[PDB]
Write a protein that binds this ligand. Structure first.
Ligand SMILES: CC(C)CCC[C@@H](C)[C@H]1CC[C@H]2[C@@H]3CC=C4C[C@@H](OC(=O)CCC(=O)O)CC[C@]4(C)[C@H]3CC[C@]12C
Ligand SMILES: CC(C)CCC[C@@H](C)[C@H]1CC[C@H]2[C@@H]3CC=C4C[C@@H](OC(=O)CCC(=O)O)CC[C@]4(C)[C@H]3CC[C@]12C
Ligand SMILES: CC(C)CCC[C@@H](C)[C@H]1CC[C@H]2[C@@H]3CC=C4C[C@@H](OC(=O)CCC(=O)O)CC[C@]4(C)[C@H]3CC[C@]12C
Length: 419
């Protein structure tokens, strides 16, 4: 073992920049939904338009995930990072010019650009950790990278409600507030893109790890994504895990998208409290993910922990469903915290379970399949729950999510694995 491995400080920068601009991307995913009523009033559109603003992120991932993976594998890390940062910045700039009562389509175009950016952004963490960090720091680097996107989602929940008060009567003030938010986002994105261009190197001068040294020394042989996908689908346990992970992530996405509508249904003039509830959910989910990772480190068992977390998530969802309409915000906070805790704690455990089931196949293809299933389930759940809430109230959509979570529990139980 003589790879001449060395560790460079640049790796930290490579992480930071990424964890920054990825964060910004997340902030742009949920900025509209959290104050969806305000934008609906401003643009004179329906809630479905604001829901589609969030759902374009999910729609763009499925068709572009695998071509993006091929581009990353061939061209390298720097091109992917530049594409993601530049697309995010361009989307923010386009949104900056969409502040008018009749310019919704401009904001939709900007959101589509950010959606295309997300495709490059999402899969970067593991590659960055492997390329730039040593064996003892890969897991921590990847965890920090994903927590960056989670924190971006939390900030997207918290900030827009405060930045833009619901001053429907005064259109000029509302336009000024929207312009301020968009310009701030655009400035941050531009700065992050400039930093990525200046400092985001392709790879360190020397390999960080012996495994990375071997990977760089010998180019990978030609591989087919379609063959790997076909082989993965033949594995029934992996298909079941895909379905359950997609169901859980789609439920989380639907809850995030429609949280403002559900809270506004029973609480009037509480957009700031809705943003606080969303941030509490996201932070509790981050804590649950960290605790679940440590728990899995302590005990290697995957099936039992995954099933327990799924059942706890279902219980929390039921409690939130039957406590939303109690007309007390504190119970909403507590229920959202518990639900987010369990929901987000499930995801890393499911991902590790997936990689364990599909060890022979590449991690990238399984990651892409899991993310695509998550996006598809998110779109379906968002549409169904939004229609139910508009027609029969939030309780109908929440019960729909509860039933889907129960189905996910049953599917998780059926999984067969010796891990
Ligand atoms: C480049 C990638 C990211 C794909 C981008 C696709 C979008 C440009 C499309 C996909 C789905 C479309 C949406 C599908 C359904 C609707 C509902 C539709 O509502 C109505 O026509 C009825 C409104 C009323 O009730 O008065 C308005 C357009 C909208 C938001 C569409 C807007 C354009 C969207 C977002
Ligand atoms: C479990 C449910 C909820 C989700 C199921 C989703 C999959 C069935 C979809 C999601 C994205 C799809 C992929 C999107 C794009 C492509 C690229 C496409 O490329 C080619 O035609 C050439 C492939 C090659 O280079 O070998 C082949 C199909 C494939 C892999 C698709 C196969 C089917 C996939 C994996
Ligand atoms: C795996 C997938 C395909 C399962 C799909 C199940 C749906 C068909 C279920 C799940 C939740 C159900 C909803 C749960 C609650 C309600 C509220 C209910 O309200 C009423 O008007 C009657 C009760 C009351 O008076 O409050 C009307 C039916 C509805 C929308 C239900 C309609 C049927 C839904 C969408």
């Amino acid at each position: 073992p003589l790879p001449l491995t060395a560790l460079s400080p640049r790796r930290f920068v490579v992480l930071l920049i990424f964890s920054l601009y990825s964060l910004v991307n997340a902030f742009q995913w949920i900025q509209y939904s959290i104050i969806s009523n305000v934008f609906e009033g401003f643009y004179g559109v329906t809630l479905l338009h604001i829901d589609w603003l969030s759902m374009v992120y999910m729609l763009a991932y499925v068709p572009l995930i695998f071509p993006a993976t091929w581009l990353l594998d061939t061209r390298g890390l720097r091109l992917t990072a530049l594409l993601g940062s530049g697309l995010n910045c361009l989307g923010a700039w386009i949104k900056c010019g969409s502040v008018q009562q009749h310019l919704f389509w401009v904001t939709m175009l900007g959101q589509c650009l950010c959606s295309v950016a997300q495709v490059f952004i999402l899969g970067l963490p593991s590659r960055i950790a492997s390329v730039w960090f040593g064996p003892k720091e890969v897991s921590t680097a990847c965890a920090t990278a994903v927590l960056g996107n989670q924190l971006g989602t939390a900030v997207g929940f918290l900030l827009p409600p405060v930045l833009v008060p619901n001053t429907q009567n005064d259109t000029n003030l509302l336009a000024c507030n929207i312009s301020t938010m968009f310009y701030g986002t655009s400035a941050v994105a531009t700065l992050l893109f400039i930093l990525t261009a200046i400092a985001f190197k392709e790879k360190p001068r020397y390999p960080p790890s012996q495994a990375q040294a071997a990977l760089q020394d010998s180019p990978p042989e030609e591989y087919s994504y379609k063959k790997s996908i076909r082989n993965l689908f033949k594995n029934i346990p992996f298909v079941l895990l895909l379905i359950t992970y997609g169901i859980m992530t789609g439920a989380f996405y639907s809850v995030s998208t429609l949280l403002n509508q559900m809270i506004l249904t029973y609480y009037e003039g509480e957009e700031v409290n809705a943003g606080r509830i969303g941030l509490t959910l996201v932070v509790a989910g981050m804590v649950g993910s960290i605790l679940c990772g440590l728990w899995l480190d302590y005990t290697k068992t995957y099936k039992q922990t995954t099933l327990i977390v799924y059942i706890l998530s279902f219980i929390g969802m039921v409690i939130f469903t039957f406590t939303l309409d109690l007309r007390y915000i504190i119970i909403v906070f507590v229920t959202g915290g518990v639900l987010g805790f369990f929901m987000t704690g499930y995801l890393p455990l499911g991902f590790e379970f997936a990689v364990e089931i599909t060890y022979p196949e590449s991690e990238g293809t399984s990651s892409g399949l899991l993310n695509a299933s998550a996006q598809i389930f998110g779109i379906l759940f968002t549409l169904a729950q939004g229609k139910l809430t508009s027609d029969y109230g939030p309780k109908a959509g929440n019960i729909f999510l509860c039933v889907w979570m129960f189905i996910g529990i049953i599917l998780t139980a059926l999984i067969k694995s010796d891990l």
